[PDB]
Design a binder for this molecule. Structure first.
Ligand SMILES: O=C(NCCc1ccncc1)NC1CCCCC1
Ligand SMILES: [Cl-]
Ligand SMILES: [Cl-]
Length: 182
């Protein structure tokens, strides 16, 4: 009851409506994206520096690294919200790559509504160091957005973009979108 048609605005880039949200996928470097929130896929200690998290932490800067460790030594966090540092965003949300991906995405969406944010950019959460399977990750990300729309929760959020390091993972996301199209 929610999905539009899959189309391609540029070479290797794909989009479809899910209710009121435009869902987009593309392969590339997530550290040169602009969005209200950029998501980092990290460890349960919020200090992973390998793969996409290496790139995010080095570009964001030592003040963001400091924010992560400061917050990690206060309570048991499922995820952590920091400033964007020298990334082009208002906040970074650091999620645990090994956690349930649907749950992690649902939390990001809810935190973005709380701040009246309109745009989100995320990696293929959990497919790096955590070694979750790409089609299970794609299914979980898109399911989280469907549930958020079904509940009438999308108000400020208008665009959700997955920027994916490996082209082979981009191909898996495309196939999952085609399976759902209306
Ligand atoms: O894939 C890589 N490095 C490739 C370079 C790269 C990766 C991501 N973002 C920018 C540059 N390392 C992997 C990460 C997962 C754990 C085992 C090492
Ligand atoms: Cl990725
Ligand atoms: Cl990961």
């Amino acid at each position: 009851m929610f999905y539009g048609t899959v189309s391609s605005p540029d070479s290797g880039v794909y989009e479809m409506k899910i209710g009121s949200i435009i869902f987009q996928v593309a392969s590339g470097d997530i550290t040169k994206e602009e969005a209200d929130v950029i998501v980092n896929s990290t460890s349960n200690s919020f200090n992973l520096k390998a793969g996409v998290s290496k790139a995010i932490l080095e570009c964001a800067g030592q003040n963001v690294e400091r924010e992560c460790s400061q917050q990690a030594q206060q309570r048991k966090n499922d995820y952590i919200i920091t400033g964007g540092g020298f990334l082009r965003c208002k906040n970074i949300i650091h999620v645990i790559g090994g956690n349930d991906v649907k749950s992690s995405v649902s939390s990001v969406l809810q935190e973005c509504e709380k701040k009246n944010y309109s745009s989100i950019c995320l990696p293929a959460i959990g497919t790096g160091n955590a070694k979750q399977h790409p089609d299970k990750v794609a299914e979980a990300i898109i399911d989280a957005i469907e549930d958020f729309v079904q509940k009438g929760s999308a108000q400020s959020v208008k665009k959700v973009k997955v920027v994916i390091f490996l082209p082979q993972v981009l191909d898996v996301f495309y196939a999952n979108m085609k399976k759902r199209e209306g």
